[PDB]
Ligand binder design. Structure first.
Ligand SMILES: O=C[C@H](O)[C@@H](O)[C@H](O)[C@H](O)COP(=O)(O)O
Ligand SMILES: O=C[C@H](O)[C@@H](O)[C@H](O)[C@H](O)COP(=O)(O)O
Ligand SMILES: [Cl-]
Lengths: 566, 558
């Protein structure tokens, strides 16, 4: 429009009209009835040859509805978008960039991927080799701190995409048998917030002489990160009594901005770079995640994580639409959000290891698809990206599941694993602790689908006064994803699965999943407030500070703040 | 009921008027903004000017609260009436923090405060003795680690308060050398994580469960007991010195092997999600930080309680916050609220509020069982600022509208100011706190974008519609007292919304179905592990989907 990548807007697509009718048909049918159809149920399961099992039977779809959804994906040219992504076309059109997180995990010997005439895999693997060598030396003690001590602590400084994914993976692997051994004696703190309390927390229990600082920022100008980096710098200067020469041995960086890293005093043999075609929220498989993960766990664990994400990439670019797990989860979510109007998705990993997975998926989803215009700048007449949130199970069952069962409908995504990282089976116990865990994983989706009717409650002998309070309407959709175990490889697969599903949804809608213009205004306005606060702290009057140009509310609360802080 | 109130009709018309107007125009009105601020004498500053209301609308909101008898309900709550009618229970979390010498509050002819203060005195003495070493582990070592076992209401509030206090100057000194792990999930990885780095001989276990029958918590307690038995070479006699409990079920605590001098009880009228000011929270907080810190926390909750009980409707912060939320959710249809504290100390505050709000008001019937004609409780989520700005604010600014609640503090627990630096690190943090609400309210039009040289190509992409609402709350500092005030503010705001809607904020029947069905799957799994075939295990009665995925699971874990 003209030359747009997928010109049939969602409402123009042939299957859109058809899918609106399906919605009218399917809203009359309860999940408890649809699930009586085993032939249907059976054809809404997919199971890959590398261990990914997905069940999407608890969705308001017939096989007919699914066929319309697949047709819609074709009409929106989603398979063609996948090829453009993989061949390195600049599909991030508002920033004129490629979108090549997938290149980060293509193995050496893969088919070249060209961006402006250069095969980007050459630089991808050159950085991976350097991380491998560097992580090996730090871990062995070949590289030491300024006073000759082994570096056994890491402060990884970074916000948003520069830590959420990494912290997800870090915690996912912490209790893994092999990873734990390799991390033995080693610690990593994530310094994210500009709140100086987070600086204090990152420093706690760390001797600077045994500590390595990793400064992680794409631009190397992010306000919080650079402030944190200078503050940690100052902590070293206090420790080393002002001797600047002591700093170089304790600092390294991950960025796309080598002028920035140099000006900060970190030389290129301590910078492990990445590229503009790696979005922050898609950066964990670049040096952003691979360096800190390699430092904590060794390069081998980090490599297996990359191989798993690659496995899921190959699936995404080669599986037929109807067998393609990311396409499928993308279609189901667009169906729930756009056609059924459900604004939220609950991300529910039945794994304490995945404590911070929902937090990473929240950025990945919301920052990608929380948009209001198409790639080509047309205003959408409808809300697009869902609100994602979550906590691991069973925890969440005692927090917000009350609402998911009896309140607002929230489509749920249950994620589980067949084997435990740290199995327990007590002799007196009927079941292993993992089986107890998983009894919940299997029971919750059926509870959401089937519910419990007043009729059943009466037969159970519930008094009539309490029947409405104990009614479970059901009809609440869910997907169940189940992997063999929490290995680096399956963590990579799960990551890549969600990375691609987010892409699929963005392409279904015609938006740009890969820019984030929505964060700019806050940054600009906060810089203005910074200036005002500086002037007041310097002793300038309100008429002198610039605050008089702000609205009356902000005027008054600033003044309260200055008065309470002076 | 709600729709029958005179002010409901009036508020339906206000909504039609207000959706045609933009906050950028409303906020030009300084007299208006000025009346949309409250500031208490214990330091809580609330600004709700960035809301789609005029002073007329607000009057209508205040009237709706009277029409729904929100003030009479407060009085019923505080006097110990059984206002949780589906369970026939009083709702007396405010009793937990009434100071010694407060007027009696009766349930079933008994002044509940006698029991409230008796447990508090026993926690003070017990915590003093553990912390000083007058009470030791079985081998005589000072106890310096706590494994607090508990799920849901039995830990989320406690972990919120714990992390909020961790970096406080005085609390940190009191916590120095002391560690606490929260064992919540039945996932045995959480057991391994709880036990990690703790020598059992220096570790105290607090088992926390209102019923003392929750599946996860009891299995956890049994698993930790086993860990103790293996350390101590099967010697039962060693366990007593390492265990204590918080529960309403003393038959269950005894039967577990914990005697009454190591049980610190609470009561049926304390909801789980309102329990952190009972023994649930007060014992582990007192253990970690010493009792004085726990008491100051209680005193802060109590200050806000008195405010809730006495402030006139229009000056009453919980009522105001609850009214504004219903305005957004019920009248404007916004289903979510973002809870956004500009404080790393409040890392787990959103997670606690998520339970408090959603488990309370995620309901579909009124107190007396009438089906509601509309959705009620909002979906709450959040992360601290500034973290969240680099995670999901993109959507809050340009995507779906999500009413936001910004929480900040005037002073830092760990102030840094660098010589080379224009502002202190806290001021940098706070620059964002002050900027974001105005970014949301005013936005940035295409016209302004053109004036700044943005090419016409990018103008749509860089447009911010604005008109997105927010509240700003500012306290003096992250002290135990202000943490208490913040907690009680939210407990009461949730209660306000419940009463406006006509629901029971205080039951949670919604969790039973998953528990009953999980117990059945447990039995099927046992039978499969024991070698019963698929047709012999009970599996045959489940839907096909579950039968298949269960068999996959057994195959893959055989
Ligand atoms: O997708 C990422 C977004 O652009 C942004 O939210 C980013 O993740 C963080 O701000 C970190 O930015 P730097 O890596 O540039 O510091
Ligand atoms: O308000 C809380 C709810 O009742 C529920 O979330 C409860 O908090 C947990 O299920 C733990 O209950 P116990 O304390 O009985 O283990
Ligand atoms: Cl996904």
């Amino acid at each position: 429009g003209p030359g747009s990548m997928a010109p049939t807007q969602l409402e123009q697509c042939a299957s859109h009209g058809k899918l609106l009718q399906e919605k009218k048909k399917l809203e009359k049918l309860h999940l408890r009835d649809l699930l009586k159809d085993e032939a249907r149920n059976d054809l809404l399961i997919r199971s890959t040859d590398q261990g990914v099992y997905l069940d999407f039977s608890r969705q308001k779809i017939t096989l007919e509805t699914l066929q319309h959804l697949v047709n819609l994906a074709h009409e929106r040219q989603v398979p063609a978008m996948v090829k453009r992504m993989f061949s390195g076309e600049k599909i991030n059109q508002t920033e004129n960039r490629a979108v090549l997180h997938v290149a980060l995990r293509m193995p050496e010997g893969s088919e070249p991927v060209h961006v402006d005439g250069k095969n980007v895999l050459d630089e991808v693997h050159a950085v991976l080799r350097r991380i491998r060598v560097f992580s090996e030396k730090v871990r062995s003690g070949e590289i030491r701190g300024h006073t000759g001590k082994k570096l056994v602590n890491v402060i990884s400084i970074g916000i948003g995409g520069s830590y959420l994914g990494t912290e997800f993976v870090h915690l996912a692997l912490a209790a893994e048998g092999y990873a734990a051994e390799k991390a033995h004696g080693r610690q990593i703190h994530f310094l994210a917030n500009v709140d100086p309390v987070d600086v204090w927390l990152a420093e706690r229990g760390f001797d600077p002489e045994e500590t390595l600082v990793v400064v992680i920022s794409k631009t190397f100008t992010t306000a919080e990160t650079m402030m944190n980096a200078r503050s940690v710098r100052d902590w070293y200067l206090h420790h080393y009594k002002g001797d600047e020469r002591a700093l170089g041995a304790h600092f390294c960086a991950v960025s796309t901005n080598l002028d920035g890293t140099s000006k900060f005093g970190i030389q290129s043999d301590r910078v492990f770079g990445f590229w503009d075609w790696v979005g922050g929220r898609y950066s964990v498989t670049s040096a952003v995640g691979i360096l800190p993960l390699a430092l904590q766990y060794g390069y081998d664990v980090a490599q297996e994580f990359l191989n798993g994400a690659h496995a899921m990439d190959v699936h995404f670019k080669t599986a037929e639409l109807a067998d393609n797990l990311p396409m499928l989860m993308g279609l189901i979510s667009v169906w729930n959000a756009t056609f059924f109007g459900y604004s939220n998705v609950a991300v529910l990993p039945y794994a304490q290891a995945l404590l911070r997975f929902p937090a990473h998926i929240q950025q990945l989803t919301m920052e990608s698809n929380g948009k209001r215009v198409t790639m080509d700048g047309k205003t959408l007449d409808f809300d697009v990206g869902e609100i994602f949130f979550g906590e691991p199970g069973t925890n969440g069952q005692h927090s917000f599941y009350q609402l998911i069962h009896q309140g607002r409908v929230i489509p749920a995504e249950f994620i589980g694993f067949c084997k435990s990282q740290r199995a327990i089976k007590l002799k007196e116990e009927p079941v292993s602790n993992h089986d107890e865990l998983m009894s919940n994983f299997f029971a919750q989706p059926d509870a959401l689908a089937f519910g419990k009717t007043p009729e059943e409650l009466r037969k159970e002998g519930i008094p009539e006064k309490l029947v409405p309070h104990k009614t479970f309407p059901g009809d609440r959709p869910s997907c169940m994803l189940l992997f063999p175990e929490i290995s680096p490889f399956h963590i990579g697969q799960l990551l890549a699965l969600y990375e691609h599903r987010v892409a699929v949804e963005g392409w279904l809608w015609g938006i740009n999943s890969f820019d984030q213009w929505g964060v700019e205004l806050g940054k600009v306005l906060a810089k203005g407030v910074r200036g005002i606060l500086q002037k007041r702290r310097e002793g300038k009057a309100p008429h002198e500070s610039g605050q008089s140009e702000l609205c009356s509310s902000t005027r008054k609360i600033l003044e309260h703040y200055v008065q309470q802080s002076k």
